[PDB]
Amino acid sequence: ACYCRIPACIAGERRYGTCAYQGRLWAFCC
Ligand SMILES: [Cl-]
């Protein structure tokens, strides 16, 4: 499933773009 993550996606995931939410930027990870 896909999550917004701070600070980075973990192994086994890949990053597919970015979230801006609550004044922070997040990796969008799947
Ligand atoms: Cl980040």
Numbering used by the authors: 1 to 30
The study reports:
The canonical dimer interface of HNP1 is formed by the antiparallel extensions of the β2 strands stabilized by the reciprocal main-chain hydrogen bonds contributed by Thr18 and Ile20, and the hydrophobic packing of the side chains of Tyr16, Tyr21, Trp26, Phe28 and the Cys2–Cys30 and Cys4–Cys19 disulfides. Further analysis of probable quaternary structures by the Protein Interfaces, Surfaces and Assemblies (PISA) software indicates that the HNP1 dimer forms a tetramer or dimer of dimers in a crystal.
Analysis of intermolecular contacts within the crystal unambiguously rules out the formation of any quaternary structure for the I20A-HNP1 mutant. The functional consequences of the I20A and L25A mutations, alone or in concert, were milder than the Y16A/F28A double mutant or the quadruple mutant. LF inhibition was less than 2-fold different than wild-type for the single mutants and about 2-fold different for the I20A/L25A double mutant, as measured by IC50 values. In the virtual colony count assay, whereas the I20A and L25A mutations each made a significant difference against S. aureus, they did not make a significant difference against E. coli or B. cereus even in the I20A/I25A double mutant.
